[PDB]
């Protein structure tokens, strides 16, 4: 929203830039004025043929006499006009090039400076400024906003002024050639602007509505695909598919409605355009018959004014372009204009020599820019003698690090002063200060380049000798020399990830090259392995002894040798002294011491919509008729001016112009019928297959097994997105575009037949010209994208070094060498800059070439139309017809190139949607095959089962697992940890078939059993049961599908689950809605409902998976009571984590590494002393302990 003064935005343009912009906008205005002058001459041409057209037909006596004066008039006149046109061509060529080239040049030249200055400004900021701002947003802000600014100051301005020039020029010529027709053409303008408004208002409203419909279905789809395992378990797939299908059923209806309305609107708009357009022309004729206007003048003012009219609409977008650019330039310049307190790019202040390194902190109060919320340092006093080494210690708050933070003058203290030697730290130059101080940080960072270069970030001027001595003095020489490439080895986030201690040593070496008088070590030893810690500690100790040092860490192994140790409490310095003294003090220090001791292009996609043989032929026939209707608009306009030019005796004219002007409209109204049709037939055809596809996609998505849903590649969101997009995309390829293409080929076809049969070689000529300028138009767009992509690749590299610089910034400021990144960034930018120079050279040529070719083409038009054709008996009225017809065939063909990417995108999107359908699972719930045993009583046999999850075939969950459980008895399953306990329940549901081994129930192998029937006999209850949005009775009735559950039945089930307390209490009772849309319930109720749907099914096998997992207090008690009442009448497998509730179980089984380890009744496992005994003792010790 905030803007920028127009002058400040251009502040980086001076001398040649302003010149370029001036000559540019000049040439632009010229280019603009050029076109309406073209239409001015066009009226003078009509007058020439009109003068001869009347006289030629006025004779009806002498013939040869008309071969003399007429041909001479046409000779001189046509030659003059052709000469002029040729004149215009060179002009538009030159001015076009000048315009685009100059403006693009200016843009590039400026944006270069913008980028450099901006990055500099980013680097120049103090750390306090970073602390409050998101770096990602800032970097993206750089890359994107500078691009917006680029788009703003670019050639768009030239286009804008050019359009304004066509506007003024058009209306100037319009007015001067006459006032009436212009005012009459202005009279219609409000009517057109309103019709375009009705066009707009409908889109914004309905586009939202269209998104809303799929959001209601998408909700079903999402909750389902989120609940996939549950719906799989209970086998309610047909129901979910049904619901989704119903939602689609609604969606398509809303769709066809929108189609009808939209098509009606478009048709009406087209009708208004036709009507006004014809009307103005009729009035024109009415003015020509009065001899008030010449027949050509009418054309001139008409076209000039309409040109001038559209120029506005064509101009407007370039306003928004420049508008956005100011808004973007605001936040950009804000940082560049911002001058900090600290600078560090400044050369100022003292640079002391022979620093002894006597440091003192005096009464320092400070807070980070969280400001008044917390004040970490309340007062302070500290000294450290020259050559000494002080160690800071503290319990928490990290006020320790604050001193190291302040000693680099990253922040100025609120009150108090940090004094290096005798002088205040603020009097001495920042850079020099940072250079005389070395720093080693807990987390070291290595910029990505050779080791030498990272060591070279200590000092720009250095030799491999100093690097060697530096790393050797840090004892890092061995480890890196053993590494390949020697000093030239790579480091960074990408590639050659090394040990922390090694990176730290490299950091210490880097710091050691700095040869600092002052050394600051903050928890550099901390957060590192104990073995390498000593290795790095050796270096750290060797890094001292030439320097004064302030060290901070959690390691009290390194503190003892310190000359002074300093404790802090609540930001207040308390204890100071040698170790023995502090241990004699028995204070905080002593305390802490004691504490720490794939394309698819097919008509196969069409074979699916081949479901409808009709609805297509209708649209195509209709659209071809429309395609045959399109050139008819030309044939009239030809003969309207044609007969009027060919009129001869005037008496018969005024009667004919009324017959055409009528007909002129008649093709209009019939255009309403055909346009609405081909839009409606294609629309309705679009919404139906969208139901068929999504219904076929969703269905087959419920076919797939859990193996496919566990895939990280497929998630609910990704599936719903893949579900929406492809179906949304295929509609576009089979939709309006195709109809338009057929309409346009039909258009050009009928047009070219008429043109070709009328004009002999007049048309054959154009057909040589036109396909060339069209192809010349497409190739231009190809070079535009090529230069665009290549440019993106080059700045991607410069933006990469920028991200590296500003993400690690707090480090680079400590090492200084920001100027390094300045220079690197510049050198990185240098290549895109020279590239942007060539861009202007190219953009101008391709533009001017395509403009000149169209003006030169317009010269060859009338030149061949006149002369050779008109010297023959061939006539002007036909020429005027052929140009219209052909050039419109072309402008219609343009829509073929414009509509190209839709099919491609739809192809890529139609690729996935067939594959997703054709994919088949290992276990398909749809198969009607399988035994369906007649015997009720369940057993379960697990024998030598081996299982690895398809997602993670590394660590096996089950190896040779063997279980057995008889009917009507509970099988308790205990385990150390893992899904092994659950994998039993998962395998019995047959979500997976095990790698090796086998599992039986009635003695039949479930693998050969019917999947649905198998799953139909199971009582599964999970940890956190998901309930879909619908009546709780429908959530309970979900337990049994293929049949509607009785009320008294879900009542009985609700009674068995002890949830009846809630259900009878609610106002809506069993009709109440749950699932967070209409109501909220706690875990207890939800679980009891899960139990209800579990036992409404009347399973012979109950499966309780950690049912009490998330729960508390009495809820566990009542839910366990329910679960306990639920079993004992059925086969059961209970993996619950409360072993106090397993104490009554028919069989307990301890799982170990996939093998059953211990098994037996409680008292037997208790009689034994082993895993189960420990499992029970450890958690049994808790309940006794809670007292």
């Amino acid at each position: 929203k905030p803007a920028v003064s127009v002058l400040t935005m251009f502040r980086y343009a001076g001398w040649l830039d302003r010149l370029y912009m001036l000559v540019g906008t000049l040439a632009a205005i010229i280019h603009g004025v050029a076109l309406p002058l073209m239409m001015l001459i066009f009226g003078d041409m009509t007058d020439s043929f009109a003068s001869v057209g009347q006289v030629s037909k006025q004779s009806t006596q002498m013939s040869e006499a008309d071969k003399r004066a007429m041909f001479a008039k046409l000779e001189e006149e046509m030659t003059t006009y052709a000469y002029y046109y040729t004149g215009i061509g060179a002009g538009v060529l030159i001015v076009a090039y000048i315009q685009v080239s100059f403006w693009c040049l200016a843009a590039g030249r400026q944006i270069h400076k913008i980028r450099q200055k901006f990055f500099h400004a980013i680097m120049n900021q103090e750390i306090g400024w970073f602390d409050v701002h998101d770096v990602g947003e800032l970097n993206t802000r750089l890359t994107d906003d500078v691009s917006k600014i680029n788009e703003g100051i670019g050639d768009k301005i030239g286009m804008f002024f050019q359009a304004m020039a066509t506007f003024f020029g058009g209306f100037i010529i319009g007015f001067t050639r006459g006032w009436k027709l212009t005012l009459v053409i202005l009279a219609i303008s409000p009517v057109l602007g309103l019709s375009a408004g009705i066009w707009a208002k409908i889109l914004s409203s309905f586009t939202d509505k269209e998104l809303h419909a799929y959001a209601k279905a998408g909700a079903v789809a999402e909750e389902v695909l989120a609940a996939i395992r549950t719906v799989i378990a209970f086998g309610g797939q047909k129901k979910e598919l049904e619901r989704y299908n119903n939602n689609l059923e609604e969606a398509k209806r809303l769709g066809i409605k929108k189609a009808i309305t939209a098509n009606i609107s478009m048709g009406a708009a087209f009708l208004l355009i036709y009507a006004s357009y014809a009307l103005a022309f009729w009035y024109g004729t009415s003015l020509v018959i009065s001899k008030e206007y010449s027949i050509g003048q009418v054309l001139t003012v008409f076209f000039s004014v309409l040109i001038g009219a559209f120029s506005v609409g064509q101009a407007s977008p370039n306003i928004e372009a420049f508008a956005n650019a100011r808004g973007a330039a605001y936040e950009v310049f804000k940082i560049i204009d911002n001058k900090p307190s600290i600078d560090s790019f400044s050369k100022s202040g003292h640079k002391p020599d022979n620093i002894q390194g006597n440091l003192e902190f005096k009464n320092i109060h400070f807070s980070y820019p969280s400001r008044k919320e917390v004040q970490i340092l309340k007062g302070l006093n500290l000294k450290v003698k020259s050559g000494q080494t002080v160690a800071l210690v503290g319990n928490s708050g990290c006020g320790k690090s604050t001193t190291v933070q302040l000693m680099q003058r990253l922040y100025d203290p609120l009150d108090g002063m940090v004094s290096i030697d005798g002088q205040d730290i603020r009097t001495i130059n920042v850079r020099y200060l940072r250079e005389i101080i070395g720093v080693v940080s807990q987390e070291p960072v290595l910029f990505a380049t050779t080791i030498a270069e990272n060591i070279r970030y200590g000092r720009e001027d250095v030799t491999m000798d100093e690097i060697e001595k530096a790393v050797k003095e840090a004892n890092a020489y061995d480890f890196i020399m053993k590494l390949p490439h020697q000093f030239d080895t790579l480091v960074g986030e990408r590639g050659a990830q090394l040990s922390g201690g090694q990176k730290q040593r490299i950091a210490i070496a880097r710091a050691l090259v700095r040869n600092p008088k002052i050394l600051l070590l903050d928890e550099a030893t901390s957060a590192l392995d104990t073995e390498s810690e000593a290795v790095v500690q050796a270096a750290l100790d060797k890094a001292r002894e030439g320097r004064t040092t302030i060290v901070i860490a959690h390691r009290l192994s390194t503190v003892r040798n310190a000359d002074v140790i300093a404790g802090f409490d609540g930001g207040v310095i308390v204890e100071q002294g040698n170790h023995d003294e502090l241990m004699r003090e028995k204070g905080i220090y002593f305390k802490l011491v004691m504490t720490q001791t794939p394309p698819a292009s097919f008509w196969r996609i069409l074979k699916l919509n081949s479901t409808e043989w009709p609805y297509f032929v209708v649209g195509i026939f209709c659209a071809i008729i429309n395609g045959g209707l399109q050139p008819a608009f030309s044939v009239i306009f030809s003969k309207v001016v044609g007969v009027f030019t060919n009129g001869g005796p005037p008496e018969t004219q005024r009667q004919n112009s009324n017959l055409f002007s009528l007909l002129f409209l008649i093709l209009g109204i019939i255009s309403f019928i055909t346009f609405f049709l081909q839009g409606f037939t294609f629309g309705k055809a679009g919404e139906i297959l969208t139901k068929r596809l999504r219904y076929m996609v969703f269905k087959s998505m419920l076919r797939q097994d859990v193996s496919w849903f566990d895939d990280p590649k497929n998630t609910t969101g990704a599936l719903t997105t893949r579900l929406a997009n492809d179906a949304a995309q295929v509609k576009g390829a089979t939709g309006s575009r195709l109809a338009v293409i057929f309409q346009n080929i039909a258009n050009l076809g009928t047009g070219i037949i008429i043109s070709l049969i009328y004009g002999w070689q007049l048309t054959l000529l154009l057909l040589a010209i036109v396909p060339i300028i069209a192809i010349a138009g497409v190739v231009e767009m190809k070079m535009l994208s090529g230069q665009a992509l290549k440019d993106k690749k080059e700045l991607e590299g410069s933006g990469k070094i920028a991200t590296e610089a500003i993400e690690n910034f707090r480090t680079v400021v400590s090492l200084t060498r920001e100027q390094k990144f300045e220079t690197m960034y510049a050198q990185s930018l240098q290549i895109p800059y020279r590239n942007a120079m060539k861009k202007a050279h190219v953009f101008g040529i391709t533009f001017s070439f395509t403009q000149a070719m169209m003006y030169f083409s317009y010269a060859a038009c009338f030149r061949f139309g006149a002369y050779l054709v008109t010297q023959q008996l061939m006539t002007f009225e036909n020429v005027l017809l052929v140009f219209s017809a052909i050039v419109f065939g072309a402008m219609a063909v343009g829509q073929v190139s414009s509509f190209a990417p839709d099919y491609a995108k739809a192809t890529v999107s139609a690729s996935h949607i067939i594959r997703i359908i054709e994919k088949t699972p290992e276990i398909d719930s749809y198969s009607t095959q399988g035994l369906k045993p007649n015997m009720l009583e369940g057993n379960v046999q697990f024998s030598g089962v081996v299982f690895n999850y398809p997602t993670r075939p590394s660590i096996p969950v089950l190896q040779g697992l063997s279980l057995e459980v008889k009917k009507g008895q509970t099988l308790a399953l205990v385990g150390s940890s893992g899904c092994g306990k659950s994998t039993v329940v998962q395998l019995l549901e047959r979500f997976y078939d095990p790698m090796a081994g086998s599992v039986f129930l009635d003695g039949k192998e479930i693998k050969q059993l019917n999947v649905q029937w198998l799953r139909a006999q199971l009582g599964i209850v999970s940890q956190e049961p998901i309930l879909f949005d619908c009546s709780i009775a429908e959530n309970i009735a979900y337990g049994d599908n293929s049949r509607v559950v009785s009320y008294e039945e879900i009542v009985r089930a609700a009674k068995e689950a002890n949830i009846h307390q809630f259900i009878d209490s609610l106002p809506d009772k069993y009709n109440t809605r749950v699932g967070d849309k209409g109501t909220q319930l706690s875990g207890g109720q939800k679980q009891r409902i899960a139990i209800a749907r579990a036992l409404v099914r009347q399973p012979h096998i109950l499966l309780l998976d950690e049912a009490t997992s998330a729960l508390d207090t009495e809820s566990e008690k009542v839910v366990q009571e329910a679960l306990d009442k639920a079993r004992e009448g059925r086969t059961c497998i209970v993996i619950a984590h409360r072993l106090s509730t397993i104490q009554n179980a028919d069989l307990i089984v301890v799982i170990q590494n996939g093998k059953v380890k211990e098994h037996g009744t409680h008292q037997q496992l208790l009689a034994q002393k082993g895993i189960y005994f420990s499992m029970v003792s450890v958690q049994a010790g808790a309940k006794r302990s809670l007292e």
Binding site: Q630, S884, F888, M891
Partner: peptide
């Protein structure tokens, strides 16, 4: 050429 046919 505008949008009818010339």
């Amino acid at each position: 050429x505008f949008x009818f046919x010339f």
